[PDB]
Design a protein around this ligand. Structure first.
Ligand SMILES: CCCCCCCCCCCCCCCCCC(=O)OC[C@H](COP(=O)([O-])OCC(O)COP(=O)([O-])OC[C@@H](COC(=O)CCCCCCCCCCCCCCCCC)OC(=O)CCCCCCCCCCCCCCCCC)OC(=O)CCCCCCCCCCCCCCCCC
Ligand code: SF4
Ligand code: SF4
Ligand code: SF4
Ligand code: SF4
Ligand code: FES
Ligand SMILES: [Mg+2]
Lengths: 176, 115, 208, 112, 125, 376, 230, 48, 97
C-alpha cells in the first residue's frame, strides 16, 4: 500500500491563477518562512547551563571502569578472566597467582582505555560483579599514558565511586 | 598441456614486449614526477629506482605472473600521473627513515635472534 | 519444536527447487550444481566460463527477471586448488525472489567483468581485485578502491596478517609521513576457542 | 490514453497491442533457429505463445494488464524487448551443449 | 585457446610480502595434538600451517608483551597434507611436514578385570 | 570539506563550474572491519555493526541478529521482535532527521538542523535509557534484546511521539514550498527507474523514480507484517521527490511507532535457550547449568551450524545486507557487508551529468551517504 | 577374516570380535560421550554417560563395556540416547559446586563441554548441595574433592599404571569419597598424570594454580630432555 | 532545584570557591561534584 | 512555559499554530527518575517437567542444503522462482500528498 507525494495538479481558474501570480510577485511563502523563524525567536531555548546543569542519565549508563569490593573490604575479583575473554577490543590484560593466604586474586589487571569501546560486555560476563562501568564520564587527560589504567587506578575508582555504583546496581539488578 | 587460460600474452615474448612498454612509460614519466611533486631527488635517482623495481622481478618466468606485474605497474603509474599519490607515497620507495639492517652473520648475532 | 525454533516454509522450498531445476535444464553447458538451503535460499554453482551468459539469462529472461545485483563478493579458501569463490546475489522484483550464483577461480585466472550485465558490479569488482587480487577481464577502469595508495598485497586473503606488514607515523627529520615495518607494543593475543567435542552430528564428515 | 506510467524514463506507448504482437512474432522467429530439443527454445516458445494468445484475445489495455500479470504493458513491452535480445545472445552462446568441465574434486565441499 | 605454461607455480611477487618474511620463515604443517586435559578429539581432524616463533619482549611502560614479526598469529587450516604442501610451495615458504598420529586400536575387555589367573585382575572398583 | 562528510575525496574535472567528471575516492575510513570480524566470536562481532552506519545503529544490529538467527535456526520471542521494530522506527526517525537536515545545511538552510537535533537528543536519551549508550547501544543481539525496557519508557516514548509531528510540520513549512528550495532540488540528479535498477540502487533512490518496492512490505521481518503504513512513491526521480519521500517516511514511522506502543506484548526478551542466550544473573549464581552456560557463552560463544546466508533489511538508507558464512565454529568464517551507500555513491558520476558544483553538492546530500558503511 | 558386520546409524562396519560399541562408533568418526572410560585404563562402566540405544532392544547399553554383537545397529543420535545423556548430565550436575570461575579446569573441562553438547540448558534441582573435605596428597596435586564426580580414573591409574594402591573409595551412597583414608602422600614418578586424566578440577596442578586459562595459551609441540626417553 | 523549569534546568549546583587545594572562584568543572550529588544531579535518581 | 500571554499570542500568530499545545521542552509530563522494581517474567522453557532439551533444540535441526541437480550424480510447464508479485493498492488514508 502506497501513496504519491508529488502528483497534484493546480487548478486553472482565474482565482487560482491570480493567487499564484500574487504569490510570485509578493513572496508570500518566503514571508511564511520568516514568520516561522520569528516564532522560534520568542520560544525558550533548550540550552542547559553546563557545567552547573547536567544532562540526564540512567542507572544503566556505561562510563569509567571500576573494580569493586565486598562489604568486608575484600576484592570481588577472582581472576576468572571472563572479561578478558569477552572483550571485543582486547582492552583487558590479566595476570594472577595464589595470594599469601592462598586466595585466587589478580596480580595485574589493566584496561587500555584507548582500546576500550565502552560496550559493557565485561560487566555482563563478570559472575561476581567485580568489574563495572561507573557513572563517571568526565575523565579527560592531558597525556595518552594517563589513560592506561592499572589495577591500582581501577581499585581507586571503585573506592571513590562505590556509593553511586552500589545505588545504580541496586536500581538495575532486577533487569539483569 | 596443463590447460591454463592466458591473461594477456600467449608466451614470454609478448610479456617482455609489454614490460618494455611499461618501462618506457615510467622512464618518460620520471622527470614530470620530480617536477610536479617537488622532490629533492634528481631524475637519475628516480630512473634508477624504476630500474631497481623492474629488476626486483627479473627472475619471473610465468607469462601470467608477468602480465599481472605489468598490470600492477600500470596501476602505479596511473596513480602517479594523476597526482592521486602524494609526496609521501612516492618517497616510500626510498626508505629514507629506516636504518640500514646488516647482512653478515656476526652483526645479526650481536643484535638479536633473527636469522 | 514450538516457541524457540524457527519455523519452516515448504511452499517456498518447493518453488525454489523447481526454479533451480528450471535453470539447470535451460543451461546445462555451465551449471554444475543447484542447492536449496534449509532456510529457503537458492544457490547455483556454475563453471567460470558461464559468468556472462548465466547472469544475462537471469537478468533478461521473462521467467527470471533478476534485475537487481544486490551484492558481489569473493570468499578465500586456501585449501582449494581454485582459491577464490566468486559469489553473486541477485534480486528479482517482478517475482519477489532472490538467487545466488557461485563460481571459482585462482590467483592467475581472470574472470569476465559483469559491467555489461549490471553496472553496479563495477565498484564491486574493483573491491574484489583490491581485497583478494582477482583480476576481471574487460573492466572499464580496474584499480584499488579501499586500500591506501601503493599498498602491497591483498588484505582479505586468509594468509595476509591481521595487522599487515607496515605502519605509518610522522617523521620530523624528513618532515612527512613515513611507513616502517610494524611493531606492536602489545601483540594481539590469539585465542583457541574451538571445543574438542563435536557440536552438530548432521554435518559429520567421513573419517577418510 | 494513459497520462503517465509513473516510472521515470518509461514513455507511454500508443498502440501497445501492435507493438506486443510484433515483438512476440520476432521472438518466435528468432527462437525458430534454435535446436528443437533445447530447453530454452521450448520454454520460451511456450510462454511467448501464452502471452501472444492473451494479447490477441483482449482489446482492453487495463484488462490485458490484469491478465498478463506483467505490470503495465509498457514494462511488458520492455520485457519482450529484453527477451528478444536474450534470445539472440543465447543463439550466439549455444548453452544447450553439455557441461564444459567438471569442477575439481572438492571444489564445492563445505565446511572446508 | 590456452597457452600451456610448463613451470611450477610461484606467486611470491604478487602477494606483497616483504622479502625477509619469505626466505627466512619456516612453516610447520601438522595435525595438532589432542589436548591432554580433555578426551574430545574434534580438534585433531584438520591440518594446520603455522610459522616459526619469533622474539617477544616486555613493553617498558606497561609490562605488556611486544612483538615485531607480523606472522606470529597466522594459522591456516587445510583438509589434507598435500593441500598445505602445495600452498606453502606456491607461496615460497620452506616447510617441515609432520605425519599425522592416530591412536592405535586397543583390545578392551571388561571381564579381564576379574581374571582367574592373569594379572589383569583388579583389586578395587 | 564541509560537504565531503570528512572522508570523501571527490576528484572532479570541471569546465568552469560545470562538472565534467566525478571520480569518488573512498577508503579514507576503511578500517578493515570484515577482516577483524573473522577474529571475533559472533557476540564479539556484534558491536562492529553499530559502527558500520553510525546514524542507524540498531537497524544494523537487527540485520546482523537476523542473519545469525537464520543460521542458528532459532526464533526470538515476540516481545523482543516488537521492541526491535519500535526501536528500528525510532532509528529511522533519527536517520531521516540527520539526512534531511544535513542536506538542507549543504544547500544552505542551516536552521532546521538545530530544531531537529533536539529531537535527536531526546531519542538518544531513549537509547541511553534502554542500553546505557547514546549511540552504540549493542542492544539488539541474536536471540532478542539484551535487557527489558525500564518502567516508564513507553510513556516517555508516547510523549515524544505525540509531539514529533509538529516538528515535522515546522520543517515542512520551512522547506517544502520555498521557491529557493525547489529551485535547488527540482530536476536535479534525475535517475530513471531502469538505470536505478541496473545501477544497484535501493530504498528511496529507487522509490523516487516510481519503483514500488519496500523490503518491509515485500519481504517482511520480525513483526512488520502486523503493522500498517504507507510507502511514499515519487514521480520525477529528482532531489525534491526524494526529500518528500523521506519526510513522508518519517510520518509513516510515527504511525508505526504508535502501533508498536499500543501492541507491546508481555513475556521474555531473549530466546529461552541457554545454549544461545545467556541466563539471568540470578540463575547463573544459583544453578550449575546456568553457570556453565554463562561461562561457555562468554568465553567460547555459541557454535553456529555451517552454512552461508544473505540476509537483508530495509534500513533507513536502503537495502542493508550481510552475507554471513559459518564454518561450524563459534567464530564466523566470512562476513561481507552490503551497504546501500556503496552502490549509491558508485552512481554519483552518472547522476551528476550536465550539472554544476552546487548541484553535485546537492546530489551528494540527496544520496544519503555515510562512509562508515561505504568503506567498512 | 574373523571380522563381523555391525551398523552405526545404518552404516556397515567390519570389526574384530570383542570390539565394544564405543570403539565401533569411533571407527566411523563418532565419539560417544564418556567420563569414566579411558582407553589406557581398565573399563569401569560407572559414569553411565556412554549409554546408547541398540535397535530393536528396549534397554540402552553402556557403549564402553558392552561388546557389540553381529548385526547390531547402533543408534547414536536417537531420542533414547539423547534423553539418557541429558538425565546422566542432570545427575552429574545435581551436586556439582558452582566453582567454574575459581576452577582451573574452566575452559578445558570435559564436564563443561559435554554439558554444553549433550545436556540440557537449565536446572530443576531445588535442594542443597553436598560438600566434602579436602585431602592432602602432596605438594604437586591440588585436591578439591567437592568437584569430584567419582569416575575412579585416578584409582585405576594409580593401581595399574603407577603400581601404587594408595587411592580408593571410602563409604558408600552419596557419601562415597575418593581418597587415601589417612594423611598419606601420592608421591610417584608418574603421579602428576592423575591431573590430566581427571576430567574435572578435583585434581589440579598446584604449581600451575590460578596463573592461566586454556584459551589464552599457545601450544608448542616439543621434546622433553630431562631424561633419555625423549 | 526548581520543578517549574523544563527537564535539564530543574536541578543545578553552585560550586564552591575552594576545593581540596586549589582556588575555584573561576576554575570550576563538573568533576568536583561528589558521587552522591553526582547521582542526584544527573537525574539517575529522584532522591537527594 | 513561563512566557507572557502577549508574547505567546505573537508566537502563535507568527507560527500559525497553537504552540502551547505541543511544547518541545517536556516540563513535567515525563516519568519519574525513580521507579518501583519489576518482576520480569520467564520464558516458556522454565518448566519442571516435559522439558527435555532434545525437543526444543533449534540448532540441531539444521541440516546441509538439499541438492537439486548434481552434475556428477512431456508437458513440463515453465516455472518462475515465485508467483508474480501482486500490484500494490493506493492508500485509503491519504493516496495523494
Ligand atoms: C524592547 C522590549 C523590552 C521589554 C522586555 O524585555 O519584556 C519582555 C517581556 C517578556 O516576554 P516573555 O519572554 O514571554 O516572558 C518570559 C518570562 O517572563 C521570563 O521571566 P524571568 O523569570 O526570566 O525574569 C528574569 C528577568 C531578569 O533577567 C535579566 O535581568 C536579564 C535581561 C536584561 C535585559 C536588559 O528577566 C526579565 O523579565 C526582564 C526583562 C528585560 C528587561 C528589559 O515581553 C513583553 O513584555 C512584550 C514586549 C514587546 C515585545 C515585542
Ligand atoms: S567495556 Fe567492552 S571494550 Fe571496554 S573493557 Fe569492558 S568488554 Fe572490553
Ligand atoms: S573482573 Fe570479574 S570477570 Fe574479570 S577476572 Fe575478575 S572476577 Fe573474572
Ligand atoms: S570441574 Fe568443570 S564444571 Fe566443575 S567447577 Fe571446575 S570448570 Fe566448572
Ligand atoms: S578425583 Fe578426578 S579422576 Fe579421581 S574419581 Fe574424582 S573425578 Fe575421577
Ligand atoms: S563411559 Fe561407559 S559408563 Fe562411563
Ligand atoms: Mg583435572
Amino acid at each position: 500500500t502506497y501513496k504519491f507525494v508529488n502528483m497534484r495538479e493546480p487548478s486553472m481558474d482565474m482565482k487560482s491563477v491570480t493567487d499564484r501570480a500574487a504569490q510570485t510577485l509578493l513572496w508570500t511563502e518566503l514571508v511564511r518562512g520568516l514568520g516561522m523563524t520569528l516564532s522560534y525567536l520568542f520560544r525558550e531555548p533548550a540550552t542547559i547551563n553546563y557545567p552547573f546543569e547536567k544532562g540526564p542519565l540512567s542507572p544503566r549508563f556505561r562510563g569509567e571502569h571500576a573494580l569493586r569490593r565486598y562489604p568486608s573490604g575484600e576484592e570481588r575479583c577472582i581472576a576468572c578472566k571472563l572479561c578478558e575473554a569477552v572483550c571485543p577490543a582486547q582492552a583487558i590484560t590479566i595476570e594472577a597467582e595464589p595470594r599469601a593466604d592462598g586466595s585466587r586474586r589478580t596480580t595485574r589487571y589493566d584496561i587500555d582505555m584507548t582500546k576500550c569501546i565502552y560496550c559493557g560486555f565485561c560487566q555482563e560476563a563478570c559472575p561476581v560483579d567485580a568489574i563495572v562501568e561507573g557513572p563517571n564520564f568526565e575523565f579527560s587527560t592531558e597525556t595518552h599514558e594517563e589513560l592506561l589504567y592499572n589495577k591500582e587506578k581501577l581499585l581507586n575508582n571503585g573506592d571513590k565511586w562505590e556509593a553511586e555504583i552500589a545505588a545504580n546496581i541496586q536500581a538495575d539488578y532486577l533487569y539483569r | 598441456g596443463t590447460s591454463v587460460k592466458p591473461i594477456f600474452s600467449r608466451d614470454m615474448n609478448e610479456a617482455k614486449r609489454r614490460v618494455r612498454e611499461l618501462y618506457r612509460a615510467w622512464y618518460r614519466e620520471v622527470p614530470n614526477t620530480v617536477h610536479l611533486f617537488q622532490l629533492d631527488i634528481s631524475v637519475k635517482q628516480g630512473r634508477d629506482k624504476v630500474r631497481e623495481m623492474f629488476m626486483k622481478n627479473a627472475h619471473v618466468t610465468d607469462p601470467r605472473v608477468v602480465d599481472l606485474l605489468v598490470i600492477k605497474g600500470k596501476m602505479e603509474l596511473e596513480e602517479t600521473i594523476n597526482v592521486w599519490k602524494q609526496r609521501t607515497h612516492i618517497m616510500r620507495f626510498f626508505h629514507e627513515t629506516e636504518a640500514p639492517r646488516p647482512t653478515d652473520f656476526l652483526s645479526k648475532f650481536y643484535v638479536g635472534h633473527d636469522p | 519444536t514450538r516457541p524457540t525454533i524457527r519455523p519452516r516454509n515448504d511452499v517456498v522450498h518447493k518453488q525454489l527447487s523447481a526454479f533451480g531445476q528450471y535453470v539447470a535444464e535451460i543451461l546445462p553447458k555451465y551449471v554444475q550444481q543447484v542447492q536449496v538451503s534449509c532456510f529457503n535460499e537458492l544457490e547455483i554453482f556454475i563453471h567460470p566460463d558461464g559468468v556472462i551468459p548465466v547472469l544475462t539469462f537471469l537478468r533478461d529472461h521473462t521467467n527470471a527477471q533478476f534485475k537487481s545485483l544486490a551484492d558481489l563478493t569473493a570468499v578465500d579458501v586456501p585449501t582449494r586448488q581454485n582459491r577464490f569463490e566468486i559469489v553473486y546475489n541477485l534480486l528479482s522484483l517482478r517475482f519477489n525472489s532472490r538467487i545466488r550464483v557461485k563460481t571459482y577461480t585462482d590467483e592467475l585466472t581472470p574472470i569476465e567483468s559483469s559491467v555489461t550485465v549490471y553496472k553496479a558490479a563495477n565498484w564491486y569488482e574493483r573491491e574484489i581485485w583490491d581485497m583478494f587480487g582477482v583480476f576481471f577481464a574487460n573492466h572499464p577502469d580496474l584499480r584499488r578502491i579501499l586500500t591506501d595508495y601503493g599498498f602491497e598485497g591483498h588484505p582479505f586473503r586468509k594468509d595476509f596478517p591481521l595487522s599487515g606488514y607496515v605502519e605509518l607515523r610522522y617523521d620530523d627529520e624528513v618532515k612527512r609521513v613515513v611507513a616502517e615495518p610494524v611493531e606492536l607494543a602489545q601483540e594481539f593475543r590469539k585465542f583457541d576457542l574451538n571445543s574438542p567435542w563435536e557440536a552438530f552430528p548432521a554435518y559429520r564428515q567421513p573419517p577418510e | 490514453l494513459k497520462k503517465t506510467t509513473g516510472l521515470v524514463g518509461l514513455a507511454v506507448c500508443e498502440t501497445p497491442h501492435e507493438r506486443l504482437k510484433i515483438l512476440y512474432t520476432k521472438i518466435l522467429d528468432v527462437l525458430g533457429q534454435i535446436p528443437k530439443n533445447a530447453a530454452y527454445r521450448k520454454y520460451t516458445e511456450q510462454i511467448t505463445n501464452e502471452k501472444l494468445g492473451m494479447v490477441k484475445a483482449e482489446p482492453d489495455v487495463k484488462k490485458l494488464e490484469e491478465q498478463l500479470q506483467g505490470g503495465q504493458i509498457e514494462e511488458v513491452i520492455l520485457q519482450a524487448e529484453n527477451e528478444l535480445s536474450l534470445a539472440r545472445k543465447m543463439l550466439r552462446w549455444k548453452p544447450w551443449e553439455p557441461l564444459v568441465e567438471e569442477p575439481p574434486a572438492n571444489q564445492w565441499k563445505w565446511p572446508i | 585457446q590456452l597457452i600451456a605454461v610448463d613451470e611450477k607455480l610461484d606467486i611470491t611477487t604478487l602477494t606483497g610480502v616483504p622479502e625477509e618474511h619469505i626466505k627466512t620463515r619456516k612453516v610447520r604443517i601438522f595435525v595438532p595434538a589432542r589436548n591432554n586435559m580433555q578426551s574430545g578429539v574434534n580438534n585433531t581432524k584438520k591440518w594446520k600451517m603455522e610459522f616459526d616463533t619469533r622474539e617477544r619482549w616486555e613493553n617498558p611502560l606497561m609490562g605488556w608483551s611486544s612483538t615485531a614479526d607480523p606472522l606470529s598469529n597466522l594459522v591456516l587450516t587445510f583438509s589434507t597434507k598435500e593441500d598445505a604442501v602445495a600452498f606453502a610451495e606456491k607461496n615460497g615458504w620452506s616447510f617441515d611436514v609432520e605425519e599425522r598420529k592416530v591412536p592405535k586400536p586397543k583390545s578392551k575387555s571388561y571381564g579381564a578385570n576379574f581374571s582367574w589367573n592373569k594379572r589383569t585382575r583388579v583389586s578395587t572398583k | 570539506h564541509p560537504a565531503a562528510h570528512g572522508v570523501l575525496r571527490l576528484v572532479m574535472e570541471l569546465s568552469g563550474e560545470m562538472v565534467r567528471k566525478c571520480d569518488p575516492h573512498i577508503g579514507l575510513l576503511h578500517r578493515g572491519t570484515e577482516k577483524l570480524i573473522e577474529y571475533k566470536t559472533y557476540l564479539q562481532a556484534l558491536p562492529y555493526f553499530d559502527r558500520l552506519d553510525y546514524v542507524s545503529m540498531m537497524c544494523n544490529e537487527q540485520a546482523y541478529s537476523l542473519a545469525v538467527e537464520k543460521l542458528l535456526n532459532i526464533q526470538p520471542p515476540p516481545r523482543a521482535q516488537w521492541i526491535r521494530v519500535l526501536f528500528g522506527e525510532i532509528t529511522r526517525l533519527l536517520n531521516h532527521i540527520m539526512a534531511v537536515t544535513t542536506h538542507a545545511l549543504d544547500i544552505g538552510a542551516m536552521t532546521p538542523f538545530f530544531w531537529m537535533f533536539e529531537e535527536r537528543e531526546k531519542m538518544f536519551e531513549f537509547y541511553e535509557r534502554v542500553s546505557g549508550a547514546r549511540m552504540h547501544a549493542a542492544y539488539i543481539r541474536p536471540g532478542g534484546v539484551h535487557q527489558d525496557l525500564p518502567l516508564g519508557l513507553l510513556d516517555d516514548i508516547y510523549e515524544f511521539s505525540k509531539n514529533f509531528s509538529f516538528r515535522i510540520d515546522e520543517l515542512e513549512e520551512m522547506l517544502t514550498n520555498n521557491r529557493i528550495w525547489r529551485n535547488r532540488t527540482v530536476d536535479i540528479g534525475v535517475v530513471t527507474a531502469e538505470d536505478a535498477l541496473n545501477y544497484g540502487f535501493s530504498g528511496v533512490m529507487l522509490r523516487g523514480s516510481g519503483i514500488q518496492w519496500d523490503l518491509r512490505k515485500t519481504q517482511p521481518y520480525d513483526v512488520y507484517d502486523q503493522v500498517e503504513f504507507d510507502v511514499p512513491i515519487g514521480s520525477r526521480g529528482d532531489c525534491y521527490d526524494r526529500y518528500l519521500c523521506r519526510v513522508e517516511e518519517m510520518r509513516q514511522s510515527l504511525r508505526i511507532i504508535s502501533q508498536c506502543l499500543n501492541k507491546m506484548p508481555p513475556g521474555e526478551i531473549k530466546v529461552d535457550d541457554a545454549k544461545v542466550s545467556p541466563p539471568k544473573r540470578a540463575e547463573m549464581k544459583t544453578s550449575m547449568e546456568s553457570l556453565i552456560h554463562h561461562f561457555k557463552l562468554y568465553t567460547e560463544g555459541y557454535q553456529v551450524p555451517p552454512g552461508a546466508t544473505y540476509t537483508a533489511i530495509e534500513a533507513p538508507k536502503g537495502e542493508f545486507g550481510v552475507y554471513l558464512v559459518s564454518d561450524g565454529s563459534s567464530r564466523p568464517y566470512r562476513c561481507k557487508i552490503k551497504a546501500p551507500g556503496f552502490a549509491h555513491l558508485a552512481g554519483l558520476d552518472k547522476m551528476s551529468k550536465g550539472h554544476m558544483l552546487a548541484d553535485v553538492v546537492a546530489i551528494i546530500g540527496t544520496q544519503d551517504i555515510v562512509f562508515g558503511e561505504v568503506d567498512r | 577374516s574373523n571380522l563381523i558386520e555391525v551398523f552405526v546409524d545404518g552404516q556397515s562396519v567390519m570389526v574384530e570380535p570383542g570390539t565394544t560399541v564405543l570403539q565401533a562408533c569411533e571407527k566411523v568418526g563418532m565419539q560417544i560421550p564418556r567420563f569414566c572410560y579411558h582407553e589406557r585404563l581398565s573399563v569401569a562402566g560407572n559414569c553411565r554417560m556412554c549409554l546408547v540405544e541398540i535397535e530393536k532392544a528396549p534397554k540402552v547399553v553402556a557403549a564402553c563395556a558392552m561388546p557389540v554383537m553381529k548385526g547390531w545397529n547402533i543408534l547414536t543420535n536417537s531420542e533414547k540416547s539423547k534423553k539418557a545423556r541429558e538425565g546422566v548430565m542432570e545427575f552429574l550436575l545435581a551436586n556439582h559446586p558452582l566453582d567454574c570461575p575459581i576452577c582451573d579446569q574452566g575452559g578445558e573441562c570435559d564436564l563443561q563441554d559435554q554439558s554444553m553438547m549433550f545436556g540440557s540448558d537449565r536446572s530443576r534441582f531445588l535442594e542443597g548441595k553436598r560438600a566434602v573435605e579436602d585431602k592432602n596428597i602432596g605438594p604437586l596435586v591440588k585436591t578439591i574433592m567437592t568437584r569430584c564426580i567419582q569416575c575412579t580414573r585416578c584409582i585405576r591409574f594409580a593401581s595399574e599404571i603407577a603400581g601404587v594402591d594408595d587411592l580408593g573409595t571410602t563409604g558408600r551412597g552419596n557419601d562415597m569419597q575418593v581418597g587415601t583414608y589417612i594423611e598419606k602422600m601420592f608421591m610417584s614418578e608418574l603421579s602428576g598424570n592423575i591431573i590430566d586424566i581427571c576430567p574435572v578440577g578435583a585434581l589440579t596442578s598446584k604449581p600451575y594454580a590460578f596463573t592461566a586459562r586454556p584459551w589464552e595459551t599457545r601450544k608448542t609441540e616439543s621434546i622433553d630432555v630431562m631424561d633419555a626417553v625423549g | 532545584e526548581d520543578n517549574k523549569q523544563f527537564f535539564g534546568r530543574h536541578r543545578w549546583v553552585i560550586y564552591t570557591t575552594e576545593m581540596n587545594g586549589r582556588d575555584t572562584f573561576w576554575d570550576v568543572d563538573g568533576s568536583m561534584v561528589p558521587p552522591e550529588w553526582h547521582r542526584w544531579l544527573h537525574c539517575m535518581t529522584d532522591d537527594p | 512555559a513561563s512566557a507572557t500571554r502577549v508574547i505567546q499570542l505573537l508566537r502563535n500568530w507568527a507560527s500559525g499554530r497553537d504552540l502551547q499545545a505541543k511544547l518541545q521542552l517536556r516540563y513535567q509530563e515525563i516519568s519519574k527518575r525513580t521507579q518501583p522494581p519489576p518482576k520480569l517474567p520467564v520464558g516458556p522453557s522454565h518448566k519442571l517437567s516435559n522439558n527435555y532439551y532434545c525437543t526444543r533444540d533449534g540448532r540441531r535441526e539444521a541440516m546441509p542444503p538439499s541438492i537439486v541437480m548434481s552434475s556428477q550424480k512431456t508437458e513440463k510447464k515453465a516455472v518462475t522462482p515465485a508467483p508474480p508479485i501482486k500490484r500494490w493498492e493506493l492508500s485509503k488514508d491519504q493516496p495523494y500528498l
